[PDB]
Design a protein around this ligand. Structure first.
Ligand code: CA
Ligand code: CA
Ligand code: CA
Ligand code: CA
Ligand code: CA
Ligand code: CA
Ligand code: CA
Ligand code: CA
Ligand code: CA
Ligand code: CA
Ligand code: CA
Ligand code: CA
Ligand code: CA
Ligand code: CA
Ligand code: CA
Ligand code: CA
Ligand code: CA
Ligand code: CA
Ligand code: CA
Ligand code: CA
Ligand code: CA
Lengths: 193, 196, 193, 194
């Protein structure tokens, strides 16, 4: 091994124009795009959770535990997006934030009750996010990006499994306690959890 | 530039949420073969825990009196049970159902005239750790073959690195026991282990 | 009393073969065997409780208080087995661990509800263990082993009575609160007890 | 049904007897052992090059104390990268074989770029080369089916390598922005106190 002989083809590949990443290495456009797509997925879920917070924070709904949970969840989802934005820049890809569509605003449900409906929606959104994460992982693996696949596994896939179980447990408890007094009590639990 | 519509895309995720009470709500892309393989590994770890407990019980005998080895095997048994429990918790995180299986009777006596009890037991422990490593790698192969990305990662992250460390650690014990020789040497090594 | 006269009959009986216990004194094979049986009983209950924990830790069951209680109980039970293994060695008996059978995996019950059913099962297991402990004490007394009897009463019988009252109270409370909200509430109490 | 005492037989009589043989080694093929040794030499060589760069920037007539400190610290860290692989080799029961280290360049001045920018561009290229080498090592592991070696490379090296590449890229970018003379000296003061 001769660093100065083998580093030559590396020093000649150092970008000249100011707009090109100096760090980018073995990071293909398809991977860059998939990371941007996931940033948009996380940001969308953040926005949906913020909508759910705004619903449960209504005076006539008055489920303070669920409001707090969705408010904190929204904040956490934004962090998930930001971590991906930072990762994008670590790899020398360019972050491209995309539009975020209007979420629903009302989360009432006659049969299920608002709490259960909202938690079932949250569970489905977390499972949807997991599918998107597995897709980002598929793009990494298809393109042979070893470090991207590891990043997704280490920072996202495990936590997503945990998030899914946590919400699943909420759905289960909400189904057990039933509407009315039980839901209010579950909400108190969540308020103080 | 709209590339994702959560409320349109969850629709299929919503009408897939179980209604029957015995069904997991969390389970997602976790196939029966993976679930079974995790149950099998739980039983592997629990068996090893029981075997180490048998070894503790032997070295704790008044006439054997190797307190460092007894302590090591006792702590190893507890750690192995933790390895089993972490897999049990993982099963439930993935929405699989834990099924504890029977645990076979271990040997009770670990004497060996030629090698000496201490070296014999450490070589046995080494072989058990290597066997467990093989089982773990087999569990990993099941995940990779079925394309379970997160199960493969769990196994690598939580088990494989530690297993390599456990194997080197016990290998070092075997080497030292061989170096010090039977009698005074083994007793001294045991004192070291007792205070390690 | 002449220690050195009375002792020469005890000094020449000190075992010489390395496989023989030096400590063992007035400890008959039946007592040694009965101690090994109780070790297996305690270990079996540890395993059953671990199976109970694994059931209540399911996302769709989501009774965190019961899950925690059975998890801690499994650990406590293994400690009960271990203390008997150590006792065996104190008396110069040889520990022989035996097979542990596969326990039930599922604990749902349509009529009683899962929580009440599992607590009634736990109560029955503790009563069975008590019967086994009293049988062990009986073996000790039949054989005139004074210190084995003492060890069982001091270390096991009192604790067993407390465990049985504790679980009986859980059963009673579960019956009082009823299924649904009540069970979930009881579970919260247990979670924080 | 799992029977530890039956299945352990295969392994129990595979336990090596000769003092020279690893007791730990399991599913670790010669090609992986060799590739780990190669990477040890890669890291050690980069450590040596950074030490050469330290020695240049520490010259009284160059007097870029921030860059000197940065390269000195980088040299020590690179030696730690080498040593972690040496320890890993022993964890897996492979035999460490240290190789020769070639003479590095001693002077890092550059008429057009200026010494600071040239040295940082060189460092960036060295880190990218090391990344390619690490990915090669990972490829050897994957090709040979060594699950734990691949995991070790990803966990201990690849993420850190990405961070080191971004870090030095940022230095190159800043040196380009501030330009030669007062700007470089000021960047150097920043790095000195970083
Ligand atoms: Ca998320
Ligand atoms: Ca932030
Ligand atoms: Ca942040
Ligand atoms: Ca571009
Ligand atoms: Ca939990
Ligand atoms: Ca283990
Ligand atoms: Ca634990
Ligand atoms: Ca535990
Ligand atoms: Ca099933
Ligand atoms: Ca990993
Ligand atoms: Ca007990
Ligand atoms: Ca203990
Ligand atoms: Ca203890
Ligand atoms: Ca006997
Ligand atoms: Ca008494
Ligand atoms: Ca009381
Ligand atoms: Ca390095
Ligand atoms: Ca060091
Ligand atoms: Ca060799
Ligand atoms: Ca990995
Ligand atoms: Ca930074």
């Amino acid at each position: 091994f001769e660093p100065f002989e083998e580093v030559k083809k590396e020093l000649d590949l150092v970008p000249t124009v100011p707009q090109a990443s100096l760090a980018r290495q073995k990071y293909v456009d398809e991977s860059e795009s998939a990371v941007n797509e996931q940033i948009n997925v996380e940001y969308n879920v953040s926005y949906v959770y913020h909508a759910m917070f705004a619903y449960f924070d209504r005076d006539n709904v008055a489920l303070r535990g669920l409001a707090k949970f969705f408010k904190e969840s929204s904040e956490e989802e934004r962090e998930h997006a930001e971590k991906l934005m930072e990762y994008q820049n670590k790899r020398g890809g360019k972050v491209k934030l995309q539009s975020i569509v209007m979420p629903l605003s009302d989360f009432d449900h006659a049969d299920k009750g608002d709490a259960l409906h909202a938690m079932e929606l949250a569970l489905s959104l977390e499972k949807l996010t997991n599918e998107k994460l597995l897709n980002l992982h598929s793009v990494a693996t298809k393109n042979g990006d070893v470090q991207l696949a590891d990043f997704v596994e280490t920072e996202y896939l495990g936590a997503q499994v945990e998030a899914i179980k946590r919400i699943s447990e909420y759905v289960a408890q909400l189904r057990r306690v039933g509407k009315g007094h039980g839901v209010w009590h579950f909400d108190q639990m969540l308020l103080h959890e």
